Amino acid sequence: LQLPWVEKYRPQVLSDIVGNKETIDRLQQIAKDGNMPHMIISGMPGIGKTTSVHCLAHELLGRSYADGVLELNASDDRGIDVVRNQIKHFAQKKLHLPPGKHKIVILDEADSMTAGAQQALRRTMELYSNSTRFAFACNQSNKIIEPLQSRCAILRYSKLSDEDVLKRLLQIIKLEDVKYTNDGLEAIIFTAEGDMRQAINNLQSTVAGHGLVNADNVFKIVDSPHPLIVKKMLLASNLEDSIQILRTDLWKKGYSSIDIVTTSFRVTKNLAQVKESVRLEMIKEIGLTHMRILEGVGTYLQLASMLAKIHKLNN
Amino acid sequence: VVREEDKLWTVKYAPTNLQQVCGNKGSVMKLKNWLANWENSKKNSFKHAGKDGSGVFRAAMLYGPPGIGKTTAAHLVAQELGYDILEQNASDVRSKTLLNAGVKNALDNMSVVGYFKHNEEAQNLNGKHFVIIMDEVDGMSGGDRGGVGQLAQFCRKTSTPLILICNERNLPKMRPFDRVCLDIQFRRPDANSIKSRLMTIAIREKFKLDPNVIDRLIQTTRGDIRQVINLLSTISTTTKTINHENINEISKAWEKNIALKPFDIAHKMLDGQIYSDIGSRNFTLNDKIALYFDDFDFTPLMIQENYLSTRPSVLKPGQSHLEAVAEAANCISLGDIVEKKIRSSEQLWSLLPLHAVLSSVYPASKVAGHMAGRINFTAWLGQNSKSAKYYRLLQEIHYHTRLGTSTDKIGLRLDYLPTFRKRLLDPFLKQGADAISSVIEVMDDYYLTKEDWDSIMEFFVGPDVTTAIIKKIPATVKSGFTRKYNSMTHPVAIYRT
Amino acid sequence: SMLEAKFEEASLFKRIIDGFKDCVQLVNFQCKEDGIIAQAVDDSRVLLVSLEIGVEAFQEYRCDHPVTLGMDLTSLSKILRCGNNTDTLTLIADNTPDSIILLFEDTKKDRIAEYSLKLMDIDADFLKIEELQYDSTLSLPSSEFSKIVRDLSQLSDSINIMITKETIKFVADGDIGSGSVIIKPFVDMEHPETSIKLEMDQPVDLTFGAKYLLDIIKGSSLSDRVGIRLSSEAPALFQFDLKSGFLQFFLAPKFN
Amino acid sequence: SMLEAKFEEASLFKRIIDGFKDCVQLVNFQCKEDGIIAQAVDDSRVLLVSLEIGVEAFQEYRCDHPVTLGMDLTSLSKILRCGNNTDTLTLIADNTPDSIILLFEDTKKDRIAEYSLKLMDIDADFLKIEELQYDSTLSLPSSEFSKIVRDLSQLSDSINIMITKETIKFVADGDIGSGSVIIKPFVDMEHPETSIKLEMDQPVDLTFGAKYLLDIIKGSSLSDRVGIRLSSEAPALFQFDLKSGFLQFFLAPKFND
Amino acid sequence: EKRSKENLPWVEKYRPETLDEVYGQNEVITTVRKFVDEGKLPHLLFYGPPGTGKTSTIVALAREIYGKNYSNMVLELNASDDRGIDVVRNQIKDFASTRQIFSKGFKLIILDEADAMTNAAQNALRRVIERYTKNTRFCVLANYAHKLTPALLSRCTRFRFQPLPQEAIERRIANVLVHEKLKLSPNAEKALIELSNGDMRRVLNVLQSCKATLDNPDEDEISDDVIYECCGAPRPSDLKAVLKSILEDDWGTAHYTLNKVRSAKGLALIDLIEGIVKILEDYELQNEETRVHLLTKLADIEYSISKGGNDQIQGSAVIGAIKASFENET
DNA sequence: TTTGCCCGGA
DNA sequence: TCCGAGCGAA
DNA sequence: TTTTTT
Ligand SMILES: Nc1ncnc2c1ncn2[C@@H]1O[C@H](COP(=O)(O)OP(=O)(O)OP(O)(O)=S)[C@@H](O)[C@H]1O
Ligand SMILES: Nc1ncnc2c1ncn2[C@@H]1O[C@H](COP(=O)(O)OP(=O)(O)OP(O)(O)=S)[C@@H](O)[C@H]1O
Ligand SMILES: Nc1ncnc2c1ncn2[C@@H]1O[C@H](COP(=O)(O)OP(=O)(O)OP(O)(O)=S)[C@@H](O)[C@H]1O
Ligand SMILES: [Mg+2]
Ligand SMILES: [Mg+2]
Ligand SMILES: [Mg+2]
C-alpha cells in the first residue's frame, strides 16, 4: 500500500509545523543552540505535539538519535518498575555527544502514567540533568503531578486556527495536484474543527470519492459535526423546531440515543451564553433521560420528552 | 567537563550555602540548630530539650509546597555541619523488607567514605557520621509496602541524624510521624525574598527584567522558585525583555493549575463569588466539575457535611435559607441514587459528570455564600464504621439466641433487647450481688457470654443509655459476677464461628 | 583498540567478579599500563571494595592510555554467564568508550561470541586507601573464618572482634544468647597452609554487621587464606590474595 | 472403526504434542492412508506449526478415507495426562465424527480407559506452505541453537540472523548492550551429529521475535539436529526430524522498520 | 456451516458476499472501493446503527483485497475476544509489526465492536496505529461513538452507515422474493418497511416468519394481515379506532374500546403507545403545552411499562394523559 | 482544618 | 497484651 | 474504581 496522506505529509522539520507560532519559534531556537529543558507539551488531539517533540529530538541529536533517545508511550509498559530500572539506567549511561546536546527521554501520552510512577521520576530528572532531558506530551496536563510540572517548561498548545489549517492544506494540495474550490476547503476546515489529522483524512476521503473538492462533494461523505447540530437543537426557540432538528438531523441519520444524550450534556455544560442556573436545571433533565437510556429505554420518545422538559425550563 | 552554558539554570544558580537560600530563614535556622546540637542532645538520651524544644527529637521532618528549597536546605545543612550524607528517594525501593536489609545497618554505623575523605583532616568529628535523608516520603506508593511505619520506627530508634521530606504533611498516611519528628514548615517565599536573585540572573544571562512584574511572576508559579527560574530560562530564548507589555500573556500561559485538597475543594465550591454572573463567567461550570474530579471520593461527602454551615449570598428573592437548604438536600438524595447506579455491577462510569452536578455543584450553587465556621471533615465515614461494628455485634448476639427466640435480628434489637435489659441489668441495681445467679440463669437459657452482656448493654439509646449506670455498679458486684460466671461451664450455640 | 586485555580462560575474571558481585552494584575500573584497579562502594556506604589485577594475570595486556570504565555488576554478570569458562576472554575498549567489548573465543571449535556492555556515569572519584598504621595484623585460612562467621551470624545480627596478646575472640550476643569463639596463633609444620598468624601492638576491639561479613566471606573461593588488619577506631581491612593481585574489603565498624 | 491408529506407548504422542503445545491452541489433524498431518496457527497469526507422522510411527495404522479432526490442544493434553505413559494408545474415529476416541489399554491387565474428546468445526486449509528454492539452508545441533537463543534472548526482544558466505551470525541489541555469535560450517567425521552445514545462494538478513524462538526451541527434545531455511520473502522454516516424520515451525520475520 | 446454506437463518443466508451486494450505502461503497483500487487504504471507522451493513462491508472489503484466502491474512477481533491492554501490547502489536505468513502483502486488523474496549486499551492502540501505518491498516466498527476516545477517533477516517432507505430495502426484498418463490402484496411491503426502522435484519427475520406462517407459500400471498399476525402488532385501523375513542368519547366508552381492541388480537400496550405517538406527531396543535404534556406523560408511562407494573392501570394512565393534554387545546 | 474500627504482626 | 493498616463494606 | 479540554 501507499502511505496515507496523514503519515506521508507528517512534518520532519520544525519549520513545517503550522500554528502555535511563538512556541515553535522557541523550539527552533533550542534546536539550534542546544540546552533543551525538561518540557511538557499539552493540548487537544492532532495539533502537532508528537510531531514537535520528534522533530526537535531529530534536529538536536542528528545521527546519534538511535542511541540517544528513549521513547515510551501508552503501548509500552511504564509502571514503577520500568521507571526505577530502565529509565534510571538510560539516564545513568555513558554517551558522548557534542557540547549542548543531551540524551532525551520522550514520554508520549504521559497523562496515562500512574501517580506513583511519576513520583519515581523526580530525583532521576534532577540528578542526571547534565546528560539527560525529559519531554512529556499529554492531552490533559492536569494529570501530570505538580512536582513534575515544577521541574518542566510548560508548553500549552492551542487549537489550530482556520488560517493555519488552510495554509497546510494548500501546501499538500499543490504537492498532490488536487482540484478544489474555496467552498470545498472551507467545508473541510468547518468539519475538521481544528484537528489537522481530521482535515487531511477528510481531504483524502473527498478526493478519493469524487475527485473535485467542492462543498457538495465534501458533504456527501463528511458529516457536519453533530455537537453543533445538538447545540442548534438546544438553542431553538420553540419546541417544534427543536424536535424537527432532533428527528431529521440526528435520529434519522443513525446517531444513537446514548450519543445524542451524552453530547447534549457536554454541550449544555459549555453554553456560556445561557445563565449557569438554567444550565444546571437542563443538566438535571438530561441526566434523568441518560439514566433511562442506560436502563435500556433509549427510544425517540424519551429524547422528545427531554426536549419538552428543557423547553418548559427555558420559558 | 560540563560547560556552564549546557546546564539548566536551576543547577547553575543553585544555592551553595545557607545564606543564598531565599525565604524561610527561620525554618533554616531551626534545622541548623537542631542538627548542630544533635550530639549534645544524644548525650542525654534526647530527654532534655532546650529553649527551642528540639533536644528530644532524633529525626526532623521538613514539609512545604514544591520547589521552595527543602532538598536544598537539607543537603546544605548536612554539608555545613560536616556530615556524610546517605540519601534515598522515590526512585529507590523503600519497602519494609528493603529498608530492613539496607539503610537500617547504617543507623548505627560509621561511614567508610566519610572516614577516607577526612582521614588526613585532624579533629573532624562529624565527617565519619551519617545524616540520613529520606526524600519524597509522600511518594511512597504500593512499591514500598510497610515503608512509612518502618520509617517511623527508625525515627524512634536511630543513633544517627535522620531528615525526612514530604510535600503534603496533613495526609492521613503521614500520621505515624506525628509524635516522633521535629516538624519544620517551609512556606512559599515572598517576591522580595527572591527579587535580588532573579535580577542577578537577569544580569548574568543578559535579558531585561522589569522588577515591577516579578510579583506577578511569583503569583503565576505560586511561589515555586524552580518554576520561576524555568520560566525565565524558557522565555528568554526568543524574548529578551519581560515587562508590562508581555507579562499578562506570559502569566496566562504559565499559570499553575494545581488540584485542591478536600477541605480546599469544599471551601471553594461553597464560595458565593463563583456563582455570580461575573464569577460564573470567570470560573466556569467545567471548572466546578473539575473540582469534583480533584477528589471524587470525598467531594460529595464534604459538600453533604458542610452545606448546612453557610450564610448564603445567592438566595433568590423571597427564598429563605431553609428553603434553599431543602432544595440542596433533595438534590443530594438524587445524587446518592446516581452514585448507587455507578458502582453497581453495571459499572456506569459515564454518569460520573452527572453525579458531580447532583452531589456537589447544584446543592452548593443553592447555598453558596460565606462559611459560618470552619469546614468540617465528613462524619459519615466514622458513623458508617460504627454502624458496621454494631451490626456485626447484633448478628453475633442473634445467632447465639437463635435457638430460643422467634424473630429476625431487627426484631431482636427493636423488641427483645429492651426486656433482656430488665432481666440482665436492672436486677443488679435493685439487688447487688444477690441477682448474680438469676442473671446467669437467663444468660444460660439464651446461650449468652459475658461478651454478649457487654454488647447488649452497648445498644441502648436515649434515656436507656447504660454507660453511667454500669460505671456506678460497685466493683464487688462486677468481680463476683465475672468470678461466678468463669467458675462454671456454659452451653455453646455455635462452636468455632 | 586502545585497550586489549586477554585472559586465557574466562573463568578467572568470572570468579573475580563473583567475589564481590553480591555486595555492590556499580564498579569503576581503571586500566593503565601496569594493570587494572577497580573500586566500588556499597549503597549504604559502609563497605568499600578494592581490586587489583596485575599484568601477570593476562596472557596478553596492552593499554595505550589510562581509561576508566563504569559498569553495573548485574549486567556484566549476566553477560559473563553467557560465556564459556574454558574460552579465551578479551576485554576490548576504544578511545573515550561508550561501551566495553567482552570477546569470547573457542579456537578448538572456531566459535566466537562478542558482547558489548554499555558503560555508566559514575560521579565518584577514587578514594585514597594508602596503607595505615594498623594496630593489629592477623592471617588465617579462609575456611575457618567463613565457618566462624556463618556460625556466629545466626546468634546475633552483629559480631564483635577482640584482639589481645596471643588471643583472638569473636563474639555474637543477641536473640539466641552469647556465642564465643577463641583462637590462638599456632604453627603446624605438617600443614602450614592452616596456620593462624597474629601480630598485635595494642589491644583492639571492634564491632561489625553480620550481613556485611557474610558478603565479605564470599571471597574465600579466590584465596586459601585471608588477612585481617584492625585499628583502634578505623575500617577493618580483609584481604584475599590472588595469584597476581588481590581483593580487599574495607568495612566501617559500629560506633562505640 | 474407520480410523484406527495404535501407538505402542502413549509417551510418543505425548512428547510430540508437548513439542508444540505452548505456541498454539487449536489444531487440525488430517488423517489419510499414508499417515497423519496436522496444522495450527498461533493467536497473533505470526507462527504456523506443521506436523507429519508417518505410518512407521504406529504399531498398527488404518485410515479407510481421509478425515479431519479439529480440537483444542489444552483439552487434548489434559486427556493425554489422564493416561499412563506405558499403556498402548489407540486413536479411533468414525466417518463424519463428532469426537475423537483415545483408548488407553494395558496388556498386563484387562483395564480399558476410553476418552472421547468433542471435535470443533474448524474449516481451514493448510496451503502446504513451503517455498521451493530457499535462499539459505543450514543445519546444526539442537542444543547449540537452544543455547544461542537462550543467551541472546536475555538481551533483546528481537534476534537477527545473518547468513553470508561460510558464516552464520546471530545478533541481539538491547538496553544493557548487545551480543553477537558467529559460527562457521564444519564437518567432523568422528562426530557427524555435531556438524554444522550451510548451503546458500543469496545472503540473508532477517529479524525475529525472541519469544517465538524461545517457543520454537522446545522442539529440541524431539530431535538432535535442527534445520533452518531462510529467504528474503518467505517465513523462516525451523524443522526438527522425527524417526518417522517431522515438526516444522514457519515463523514470519519482523517488518523492516 | 452444516449441510446446505438453505439450513441457515435468512439473516445469515443473505449476508452480502461482495461489495456489489451491499445496498443503501452507495457513497461509502464507492469511496472505499476506489480506495482499494488506487492502493490508498487509510485507517477506517464504520459508525452506525444495528443491521446497516458494517461487518458485511468490512468482510467484503477484505475478501476483495486478499481474495478467497482472506481469513488467514487478517486479524479480526470483536467483543467475544479479550482485548485488554495485554492483548493490544502482545497479539495486536506482533501482528502489526510482522510480515504475512501465507502471502506477501500489507496487514489488515479489524476491531469489530470496538466500543466494547476499555479506555486503557484504546490509548495503548494510538502509537501502534501510527507507528506501523506503512505496512498495517486498522478498521474500527462501532454503534456508539461516545465510548471511543477522542484520540482514537482522530486517527480514523470516519464513515457513517445510514439507516437503510426505502429503495434499498425494496430491492433486497425483491431479490429475496425471487430466490424464495415468495409473493408479497404492496401494502404488506409498506408495513414491513415501516416496522423495520431501516434495519435489514428485522426485514429478513419478519419475512422468514411470514413465509413460515403461510399454509401454501407457493400460492398463498403475504398480505399485511399476515405480517400483523406473525408480529402480534396492531393494525393501523386499530390504532386509529383507539385514538378516536380516546379523543371523542366518554371515559366508560374509551376504556371499553381500549380493552376490546386489545382483547381482539391480544395486543400489547406499549405497541399501541408507539403507534399513537407516531400518529400524534403529525397533528397540528394550537398550544405547545399540549405537546409538552403528551410527550412527558407518555414517556413516563413507557418507562414504567419497561419495569412491568399493572397493565390495566397503565392503560387508564394512557387514556387520562391524552385527554388531559388535549384539554389544553381548548 | 481528616473518623471508627481495629490488620498483621511483635 | 498492644497497636493502629486501610477502607468505608450498615 | 475515574469524564472531559478548546
Ligand atoms: N501543526 C501541524 N502541522 C502540520 N501537520 C500537523 C500538525 N498537527 C497535526 N498534523 C498532522 O496530523 C498528524 C498528527 O500530528 P500529531 O503531532 O501526531 O498530533 P498529536 O497532537 O500528537 O495528537 P494526539 O495528542 O496523539 S491525539 C501529523 O502527521 C501531521 O500530518
Ligand atoms: N529558596 C530557594 N532559593 C534559591 N533557589 C531555590 C529555592 N528554592 C528552590 N530553588 C531553586 O529550585 C531548585 C530546586 O530546589 P529544591 O530544594 O529541590 O526544591 P524542593 O522544595 O525540594 O521541591 P520538591 O519538594 O522536590 S517538588 C534549586 O536548585 C534552586 O535552583
Ligand atoms: N446494507 C445491507 N445490504 C444487504 N444486507 C444487509 C445490509 N445491512 C444488513 N444486512 C443484512 O443484515 C445482516 C447483518 O448485516 P451486518 O453487516 O452484520 O450488520 P451490522 O451493521 O454489522 O450490525 P451491528 O453494528 O453488528 S448490530 C446481513 O447478513 C445482511 O443479511
Ligand atoms: Mg501524539
Ligand atoms: Mg526535592
Ligand atoms: Mg456488525
Which residues are registered as beta bridge partners of D115? D102
Phi/psi for B289 (5° steps) reads -65, -40
Return the number of CB contacts < 8 Å for A and B: 149
| Strand arrangement of the beta sheet that strand B130-134 belongs to | B84-88, B130-134, B162-166, B59-63, B182-185
Ligand 1 binding pocket includes A10 (Cβ within 6 Å): yes
Three-state secondary structure string covering B197-254: HHHHHHHHHCCEECHHHHHHHHHHCCCCHHHHHHHHHHHCCCCCEECCCCHHHHHHHC
> What does the alpha-carbon distance between residue B84 and residue B112 come to, in Å, rounded to a whole number?
10
> E90 and D44 in contact by Cβ < 8 A?
yes
Q: What single-letter DSSP state applies at residue B492?
A: -
E6 burial (CB, 10 Å; 0-12 / 13-18 / 19+) is: exposed
User: Which residues lie closer than 8 Å to A233 by C-beta, 6 or more apart?
Assistant: A242, A245, A246, A249, A250, A264, A307
Cell, residue B201: 540572573
**Could you tell me the distance, in angstroms and rounded to a whole number, from the CA of residue E57 to the centre of ligand 6?**
9
Neighbours of chain B (3+ CB pairs under 8 A): A, C
A225 labeled binding residue: no
Contact at 8 Å (CB) between E292 and A239? yes
Which residues are registered as beta bridge partners of C168? C163, C183
User: Left (φ > 0), alpha (ψ -120 to 50) or beta: where does E24 sit?
Assistant: left
Label the pairing between strands E157-160 and E44-47: parallel
**Could you tell me the distance, in angstroms and rounded to a whole number, from the CA of residue E14 to the centre of ligand 3?**
9
Nearest ligand 1 atom, CA A17: 3
Phi/psi for B348 (5° steps) reads -95, 70
User: Left (φ > 0), alpha (ψ -120 to 50) or beta: where does E198 sit?
Assistant: left
User: Which residues lie closer than 8 Å to E310 by C-beta, 6 or more apart?
Assistant: none
Contact at 8 Å (CB) between B460 and B412? no
> What does the alpha-carbon distance between residue B98 and residue B75 come to, in Å, rounded to a whole number?
23
> What does the alpha-carbon distance between residue A133 and residue A125 come to, in Å, rounded to a whole number?
7
User: Which residues lie closer than 8 Å to C221 by C-beta, 6 or more apart?
Assistant: C15, C18, C19
Nearest-Cα residue of chain D relative to residue E133: D257
Residue D228's Cβ-side half-sphere holds a number of Cα atoms within 13 Å equal to: 24
> C116 and D181 in contact by Cβ < 8 A?
no
Show which positions of strand H are touched by protein (CB under 7 A): 1-6
Which parts of chain A fold into alpha helices (H)? 5-8, 21-33, 49-61, 65-68, 80-82, 88-92, 115-119, 122-127, 146-150, 162-176, 182-192, 196-210, 215-221, 226-235, 239-245, 257-269, 276-292, 300-313
> What does the alpha-carbon distance between residue D103 and residue D83 come to, in Å, rounded to a whole number?
9
> What does the alpha-carbon distance between residue A161 and residue E40 come to, in Å, rounded to a whole number?
28
Phi/psi for E118 (5° steps) reads -75, 165
Contact at 8 Å (CB) between B260 and A142? no
Name the residue of E201, E202, E204, E208 to mutate for ligand 3: max ligand atoms within 8 A of Cβ: E201
A187 and A315 inside one domain: no
Helix, strand, coil percentages (3-state) for chain C, rounded to 5, are 20, 45, 30
Residue ranges with strand state E in D33-185: 35-41, 47-54, 60-63, 67-72, 88-93, 99-105, 112-118, 136-141, 158-164, 167-173, 177-183
> What does the alpha-carbon distance between residue B331 and residue B308 come to, in Å, rounded to a whole number?
14
Which parts of B435-496 fold into alpha helices (H)? 436-445, 450-458, 467-472, 475-486
> What does the alpha-carbon distance between residue B261 and residue B377 come to, in Å, rounded to a whole number?
12
User: Which residues lie closer than 8 Å to B85 by C-beta, 6 or more apart?
Assistant: B75, B78, B79, B130, B131, B133
A182 and A146 inside one domain: no
Cell, residue A126: 534532577
D105 burial (CB, 10 Å; 0-12 / 13-18 / 19+) is: middle
> What does the alpha-carbon distance between residue D170 and residue D181 come to, in Å, rounded to a whole number?
5
Q: Is D64 helix (H, G, I), strand (E, B) or coil?
A: coil
The candidate with the shortest Cα–Cα distance to A126, out of A114, A138, A134, A116, is A134
| B157, B161, B167, B171 alpha-carbon torsion, rounded to 10° | 20
Name the residue of E30, E45, E56, E77 to mutate for ligand 3: max ligand atoms within 8 A of Cβ: E56
> Quick one: how far is CA B60 from the chain centroid?
18
Contact at 8 Å (CB) between D234 and D227? no
Q: Is A137 helix (H, G, I), strand (E, B) or coil?
A: strand
Label the pairing between strands E136-142 and E44-47: parallel
User: Which residues lie closer than 8 Å to B131 by C-beta, 6 or more apart?
Assistant: B35, B78, B81, B83, B84, B85, B86, B160, B161, B162, B163
Contact at 8 Å (CB) between E295 and A304? yes
Task: Give the method used.
Answer: cryo-EM
CB atoms within 10 A of CB B478: 13
Q: Max CA-CA distance within chain E?
A: 77
A189 and A242 inside one domain: no
CB atoms within 10 A of CB E5: 10
Tracing cell 563497605 back to the chain, one arrives at: C47
Label the pairing between strands D136-141 and D112-118: unpaired
Ligand 1 binding pocket includes A139 (Cβ within 6 Å): yes
AA identity, residue B168: E
Cell, residue A303: 429524547
H or E element, residue E131? helix E119-131
Q: What single-letter DSSP state applies at residue D184?
A: -
Range of the domain at A53: 1-160
> E99 and D254 in contact by Cβ < 8 A?
yes
Cell, residue D220: 529440541
| Strand arrangement of the beta sheet that strand D67-72 belongs to | D67-72, D26-32, D35-41, D47-54, D246-251, D236-241, D225-230, D136-141, D197-200
H or E element, residue C27? strand C26-32
Tracing cell 465424527 back to the chain, one arrives at: D97
Sign of torsion, CA B5 B7 B9 B14?
Answer: negative
Contact at 8 Å (CB) between B141 and A115? yes
Tell me which of B83, B103, B116, B157 to substitute to probe the interface with C (most C C-beta atoms closer than 10 Å): B116
A154 and A33 inside one domain: yes
AA identity, residue C162: M
The candidate with the shortest Cα–Cα distance to B417, out of B387, B452, B377, is B452
> What does the alpha-carbon distance between residue E222 and residue E213 come to, in Å, rounded to a whole number?
9
Contact at 8 Å (CB) between A122 and B89? yes
| B459, B461, B467, B468 alpha-carbon torsion, rounded to 10° | -160
> What does the alpha-carbon distance between residue D198 and residue D182 come to, in Å, rounded to a whole number?
13
Nearest ligand 3 atom, CA E54: 21
Tell me which of D156, D175, D257 to substitute to probe the interface with A (most A C-beta atoms closer than 10 Å): D175
AA identity, residue C58: F
Q: What b/e readout covers B213-225, taking b as 16+ CB neighbours within 10 angstroms?
A: bbeebbebbbbbb
Q: Does E124 touch chain A (CB under 8 A)?
A: yes
Label the pairing between strands D67-72 and C158-164: unpaired
H or E element, residue B326? helix B321-342
User: How big is the CA angle at D172 (ends D166 and D178), to the nearest 5 degrees?
Assistant: 110
A197 labeled binding residue: yes
| Strand arrangement of the beta sheet that strand D99-105 belongs to | D60-63, D3-7, D88-93, D99-105, D112-118
User: How big is the CA angle at E196 (ends E194 and E199), to the nearest 5 degrees?
Assistant: 140
CB atoms within 10 A of CB E178: 9
Please give the tally of structural domains in chain A.
3
Domain-terminating residue out of A117, A134, A160: A160
A84 and A153 inside one domain: yes
Q: Which nucleotide is nearest to B385 (CA to C1')?
A: F4
Measure Cα distances from B477 to A66, B431, C175 in Å.
85, 10, 45
Q: Which residues line ligand 3 (CB under 6 A)?
A: E 11-12, 14-16, 22-25, 50-56, 143, 164, 172, 200-201, 204
Cell, residue E280: 400524534
CA of B386 to C1' of G4 (A): 17
User: Which residues lie closer than 8 Å to D108 by C-beta, 6 or more apart?
Assistant: none
* Start-to-end Cα distance in chain C: 52
> What does the alpha-carbon distance between residue A244 and residue E283 come to, in Å, rounded to a whole number?
14
B339 burial (CB, 10 Å; 0-12 / 13-18 / 19+) is: middle
Q: What b/e readout covers C153-184, taking b as 16+ CB neighbours within 10 angstroms?
A: bebbebbbbbbeeeebebbbeeeeeebebeee
| A227, A230, A232, A235 alpha-carbon torsion, rounded to 10° | -120
DSSP codes, E243-309? HHHHHHS-HHHHHHHHHHHHHHHT--HHHHHHHHHHHHHT---S-HHHHHHHHHHHHHHHHHHHT--
> C252 and B102 in contact by Cβ < 8 A?
no
> What does the alpha-carbon distance between residue B263 and residue B306 come to, in Å, rounded to a whole number?
10
Tell me which of D46, D49, D233 to substitute to probe the interface with E (most E C-beta atoms closer than 10 Å): D46
User: Which residues lie closer than 8 Å to C204 by C-beta, 6 or more apart?
Assistant: C135, C136, C161, C162, C163, C230, C231, C232
* Start-to-end Cα distance in chain E: 64
Which parts of B81-182 fold into alpha helices (H)? 96-101, 112-117, 147-157
Residue ranges with strand state E in chain D: 3-7, 26-32, 35-41, 47-54, 60-63, 67-72, 88-93, 99-105, 112-118, 136-141, 158-164, 167-173, 177-183, 197-200, 204-209, 225-230, 236-241, 246-251
Three-state secondary structure string covering C155-210: HCCEEEEEEECCEEEEEEEECCEEEEEEECCCCCCCCHHHCCEEEECCCEEEEEEH
> What does the alpha-carbon distance between residue A134 and residue A103 come to, in Å, rounded to a whole number?
9
Measure Cα distances from D41 to A292, C94, D36, D140 in Å.
45, 47, 17, 26
Which residue's C-alpha is at the least distance from the C1' of F5? B385
Which residues are registered as beta bridge partners of D254? E98
Q: What b/e readout covers A184-210, taking b as 16+ CB neighbours within 10 angstroms?
A: bbebbbbbbbbbbbbbbbbbbbbbbbb
Give residues lining strand F (CB < 7 Å).
Answer: B 170-172, 261-264, 267, 374-375, 377, 379, 381-383, 385-386, 388-389, 392
* Start-to-end Cα distance in chain D: 54
* Minimum distance, in Å, between the CA of residue B89 and any CA atom of chain C: 13
Ligand 2 binding pocket includes B22 (Cβ within 6 Å): yes
User: Which residues lie closer than 8 Å to B153 by C-beta, 6 or more apart?
Assistant: none
> What does the alpha-carbon distance between residue A103 and residue A90 come to, in Å, rounded to a whole number?
9
User: Which residues lie closer than 8 Å to B16 by C-beta, 6 or more apart?
Assistant: B76
Q: What single-letter DSSP state applies at residue E167?
A: H
Can you give the length of chain B in residues? 497
H or E element, residue B325? helix B321-342
Q: What b/e readout covers E191-221, taking b as 16+ CB neighbours within 10 angstroms?
A: bbbeebebbbebbbbbbbebbeebeebeeee
H or E element, residue C115? strand C111-118
User: Which residues lie closer than 8 Å to C78 by C-beta, 6 or more apart?
Assistant: D154, D176
Contact at 8 Å (CB) between B244 and B210? yes
Cβ-based interface (< 8 Å): residues of D facing E: 41, 43-48, 121, 123-125, 127, 129, 209, 233, 235, 250, 252-255
Which parts of chain C fold into alpha helices (H)? 11-20, 73-81, 142-155, 210-216
> What does the alpha-carbon distance between residue B367 and residue E254 come to, in Å, rounded to a whole number?
49
> Quick one: how far is CA E236 from the chain centroid?
23
| Strand arrangement of the beta sheet that strand C204-209 belongs to | C177-183, C167-174, C158-164, C204-209
Asked whether residue B145, judged by its CB, lies under 7 Å from any atom of the DNA or RNA strand G, the reply is: yes
> C118 and D182 in contact by Cβ < 8 A?
no
Can you give the length of chain E in residues? 330
Cell, residue C169: 575472640
Sign of torsion, CA B104 B108 B109 B113?
Answer: positive
User: How big is the CA angle at A137 (ends A132 and A138), to the nearest 5 degrees?
Assistant: 145
- Where along chain C do its domains lie? 1-256
Give residues lining strand H (CB < 7 Å).
Answer: A 42-45, 139-140, 143, 158-159, 193-194, 262, 265-266, 269-270; B 286, 289-290, 293, 296-297, 347, 349-350, 352-353; E 119, 146, 150
> E302 and A258 in contact by Cβ < 8 A?
no
Sign of torsion, CA B26 B30 B31 B36?
Answer: positive
Contact at 8 Å (CB) between B307 and B363? yes
Which residues are registered as beta bridge partners of E44? E139, E157
- Where along chain E do its domains lie? 1-164, 165-233, 234-330
Phi/psi for B22 (5° steps) reads -95, 140
Closest residue (by CA) to atom 11 of ligand 3?
A: E200
| Strand arrangement of the beta sheet that strand C99-106 belongs to | C60-63, C3-7, C88-93, C99-106, C111-118, D177-183, D167-173, D158-164, D204-209
Q: What single-letter DSSP state applies at residue D139?
A: E
Please indicate whether chains E and D are in contact, defined as at least 3 beta carbon pairs under 8 Å.
yes
H or E element, residue D77? helix D73-82
A205 and A266 inside one domain: no
Phi/psi for D24 (5° steps) reads -135, 165
User: Which residues lie closer than 8 Å to A168 by C-beta, 6 or more apart?
Assistant: A18, A196, A199
Measure Cα distances from E90 to A136, A225, D23, E79 in Å.
25, 35, 14, 18
> What does the alpha-carbon distance between residue A52 and residue A33 come to, in Å, rounded to a whole number?
17
**Could you tell me the distance, in angstroms and rounded to a whole number, from the CA of residue A182 to the centre of ligand 4?**
30
The candidate with the shortest Cα–Cα distance to D168, out of D202, D198, D213, D134, is D198
Cell, residue B326: 431543602
